[PDB]
Structures are given as structure tokens and as C-alpha cells.
């Protein structure tokens, strides 16, 4: 036999509209349409009727725009932060194929789409033909990006750290907030060096924190290891840093999204001595998706 | 503009710092294994020769004689006060003390050589460690001619 009916969604601007990509599990890359907070979603629900002769008895057809946050792949732990409905058909029949117009006016999309370890945030259109025992359901995924402008305050990070009477350094990164294709311009200045340093590197670390209160799970992933020194410095030596963030394709910093999860980035500076002992200093940086002019 | 050539501006390095010798010099040699005693008393000692320029070490050069038990005492003291994960010693080989083996037992040369390297391995790790250099036991071991086991651990 097969299926009696097949649901297909086609957006009104399905030719001109820009798409975007998403890294899922095992290195797979999906491509869905791109949307922005405030935009209207509109199109056609097209029902292909497959079994000619037969009839489809339903108790109503609808389409939903859905934005939600899924935790630990646990269906019971899904949380919808946006839900809009358009009833397309009353209870009735379908003998042949038919389409239905829909439009969701100026749709609020407060958060950016994200697929992590213990968290997913996704938007989609869900068409539902309601039947007596089992609904025909079709999901249709969308990407939402949250944009921002150049920040009001952006101070350089500058810090004197060390181990007492062994190593003193002063590191400086040129900003606190870097856009996704920005550049870490910085320097490491050595004030006291009484250990034997083999090499030094800057690392980019992405923490994904899930849960509420004492319920807290942090998933850490070391996105970049970037060597910046090779060999022993002496005091008074300055080492330059120029690390292009474009190379590693990170997400924006996302802080307490719906009071459910965070995603934060850190600059972990690490020096390594001759006996492989490892001295470090972590510093949070905010990432943000820059709005291109237009 | 065709290339992003941005760097932060640097302070010129003072020429004394730039050329003058580095301040992280520390080498410890374990050498010259020697029997001390006769008969059942016998044990091997090694020369622990230090060269440094770190202010914390109270002699720039030192030479002392140490026993493998002393190395165990150092490691044992560091495991209590220091809170440093201390590296391993090359190992107490008890069954080498047993009589009528097919080798010279505790005074076998392939043994003493291999142990000697392990102690050099151990002491250079321990002595290079920052948190370890504070503790009184390390200086006591490297630079006092005899260790005073009845001591109160400081620093």
C-alpha cells in the first residue's frame, strides 16, 4: 500500500530565501531555511493524495509554528517557548489532493537555534491531520539566527597572574566580546621566569551548561589548541597573539536561554614546562553573531 | 588594505634581561654509587650533586651522599604536607635482598645503574616542581649533609 497521504510544506519565498547549516551528531550537516526574530512565516501545505479510489476521514487539519528546547533527548523534558496555530480544515474527508494557505504574522523568535550535547533548540512547522487513532504529522525545520550590533562597552582584558616567585606574566586580549569571524589580537608579557617553559598555547573552550540550580551538567569541548610560543622566554619578553576565530566556526554565547541552558566560551592560556607540568588561566569571552550591513 | 597585520604594541626588552643568563637554571646529577659497611649492614649510597641559580636554594652548588631510603623519606614527606602528585621511585626491590640468587642481589650492576637513572629521573621532577621547592624536606634532602628525620615540616 504505502501512505494514503503525504504532507509537504512550501514557503512563499522558497526561491529567494537564504538557507543556513547545522552541525548535528556524527559530523552530519543539515540545511534548513533561515529566519529572524520578527519575520512572518507563510506558505502552502500541499497534501499529495496517493491512493486513488480511497478516502481519508479526519477530525481536522492544522499547522503549528513551534519553537522549543529539548533536554537530554528526553521527550518528557521538551519545553515549548513559542506556539502558534492555524486551523486549515474542519473535520471531514479528503478524496483528492489539496493545498492550504497559511501565514503567521510577524513571528517572535527570541532565541537562536542550537544543537548541543544535552540541549537542542529548534524551530519548525508541524502539520497535523487528526485521525481517529493515529495522527498524520509532518515536521518542517527552520534555522533562526539572533543578531546583534557592535557593543556599547568593550574593554580589553588585561591581567597579571602567576605562581609566586616562579612565574609572573601579564596577558592582554584586545576585547571581551568578539564576533564569530573576529580575531583575538593579544600579547603575553613575561615579568619573572624561574621555570623552564617548553611551549605555550591559547585554547578556545566551549562549555554547555544544562539544568536548574543544584541540577547542573556542564559539557566541555576544547574547540581550538593554538600554539603561540615555542621555547623558553626570559623576563621582559613579549609574545604576540593573532588567533582568527573564523577557522573554528563556533556558536554565539547564549546565557540562561529560557532559564534552561547556557553556552559560554573561554580563552584558556596554557604554558607547559620541560617535565610536562601545565600552568593555565581561563578567561571567559562573549561571542556574538554580527549583523552584516544588509 | 589586503592583510590584517594587527598586533598590540610591545615594550622593548631591557638588554640585561635579553642577553644575561636565564633565571631557571637547575640540574641535579645522581652519580657515583658506593657500598657503605660490611656484611649484613651493607647498603649503597649515591652522590646528589646540585647546580642552580634559583634564590630559594640556599647554596648555588652542593654535593651530598644519599641512600635509597632517604629518597623514600623525601617522597613520603612530600606526600603528606605538599599536596603535590609526587612521581614514582624506581622501586624497592625486596626479593633482591634474599640470599643465593643468580645475581649479586642488591649490588647487581644492571640493577644499580637502572635504579640510579630512576632516582635522577625522580629528583629532577620533584626539584623542578614549584610547590615542592617551598617545602623544607626538599632542601634538607639536597643540601644538608645529613637528614634530620625528627623535624617539624615547615613552608
Amino acid at each position: 500500500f504505502g501512505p494514503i497521504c503525504e504532507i509537504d510544506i512550501v514557503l512563499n519565498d522558497g526561491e529567494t530565501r537564504k538557507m543556513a547549516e547545522m552541525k548535528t551528531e556524527d559530523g552530519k550537516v543539515e540545511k534548513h531555511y533561515l529566519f529572524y526574530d520578527g519575520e512572518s512565516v507563510s506558505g502552502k501545505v500541499n497534501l499529495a493524495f496517493k491512493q486513488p479510489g480511497k478516502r481519508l476521514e479526519h477530525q481536522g487539519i492544522r499547522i503549528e509554528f513551534v519553537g522549543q528546547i529539548e533536554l537530554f533527548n528526553d521527550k518528557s523534558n521538551t519545553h515549548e517557548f513559542v506556539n502558534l496555530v492555524k486551523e486549515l480544515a474542519l473535520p471531514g474527508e479528503l478524496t483528492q489532493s489539496r493545498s492550504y494557505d497559511f501565514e503567521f504574522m510577524q513571528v517572535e523568535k527570541p532565541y537562536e537555534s542550537y544543537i548541543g550535547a544535552n540541549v537542542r533548540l529548534r524551530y519548525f512547522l508541524k502539520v497535523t491531520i487528526v485521525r481517529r487513532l493515529t495522527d498524520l504529522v509532518k515536521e518542517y525545520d527552520l534555522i533562526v539566527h539572533q543578531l546583534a550590533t557592535y557593543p556599547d562597552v568593550n574593554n580589553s582584558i588585561k591581567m597579571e597572574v602567576g605562581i609566586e616567585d616562579c612565574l609572573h606574566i601579564e596577558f592582554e586580549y584586545n576585547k571581551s566580546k568578539y564576533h564569530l569571524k573576529d580575531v583575538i589580537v593579544g600579547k603575553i608579557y613575561f615579568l619573572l621566569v624561574r621555570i623552564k617553559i617548553q611551549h605555550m598555547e591559547l585554547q578556545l573552550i566551549k562549555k554547555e551548561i544544562t539544568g536548574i540550580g543544584p541540577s547542573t551538567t556542564t559539557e566541555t569541548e576544547t574547540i581550538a589548541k593554538y600554539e603561540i610560543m615555542d621555547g623558553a622566554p626570559v623576563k621582559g619578553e613579549s609574545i604576540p597573539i593573532r588567533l582568527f576565530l573564523a577557522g573554528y566556526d563556533p556558536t554565539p554565547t547564549m546565557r540562561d536561554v529560557n532559564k534552561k541552558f547556557s553556552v559560554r566560551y573561554f580563552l584558556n592560556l596554557v604554558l607547559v614546562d620541560e617535565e610536562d607540568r601545565r600552568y593555565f588561566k581561563q578567561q571567559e569571552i562573549i561571542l556574538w553573531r554580527k549583523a552584516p550591513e544588509k | 588594505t589586503v592583510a590584517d597585520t594587527r598586533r598590540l604594541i610591545t615594550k622593548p626588552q631591557n638588554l640585561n634581561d635579553a642577553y644575561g643568563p636565564p633565571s631557571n637554571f637547575l640540574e641535579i646529577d645522581v652519580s657515583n654509587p658506593q657500598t657503605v659497611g660490611v656484611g649484613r649492614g651493607r647498603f649503597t649510597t649515591y652522590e646528589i650533586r646540585v647546580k642552580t641559580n634559583l634564590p630559594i636554594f640556599k647554596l648555588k652548588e652542593s654535593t651530598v651522599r644519599r641512600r635509597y631510603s632517604d629518597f623514600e623519606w623525601l617522597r613520603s614527606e612530600l606526600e603528606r604536607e605538599s599536596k603535590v602528585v609526587v612521581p614514582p621511585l624506581p622501586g624497592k626491590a625486596f626479593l633482591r635482598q634474599l640470599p643465593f640468587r643468580g645475581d649479586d642481589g642488591i649490588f647487581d650492576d644492571n640493577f644499580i645503574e637502572e635504579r640510579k637513572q630512576g632516582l635522577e629521573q625522580f629528583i629532577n621532577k620533584v626539584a623542578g616542581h614549584p610547590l615542592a621547592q617551598n617545602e623544607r624536606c626538599l632542601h634538607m634532602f639536597l643540601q644538608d649533609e645529613i637528614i634530620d628525620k625528627s623535624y617539624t615540616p615547615s613552608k
Binding site: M159, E160, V161, G162, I163, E164, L167, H168, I169, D276, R277, R278, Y279, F280, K281 | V84, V85, P130, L131
Partner: peptide, 10 residues
């Protein structure tokens, strides 16, 4: 396995 020491502010 490999020692990791946090650098303190002065």
C-alpha cells in the same frame, strides 16, 4: 596524569 596548576592573580 599531567599536573594542572591554576595561575593566581597578584
Amino acid at each position: 596524569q599531567p599536573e594542572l596548576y591554576l595561575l593566581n592573580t597578584m
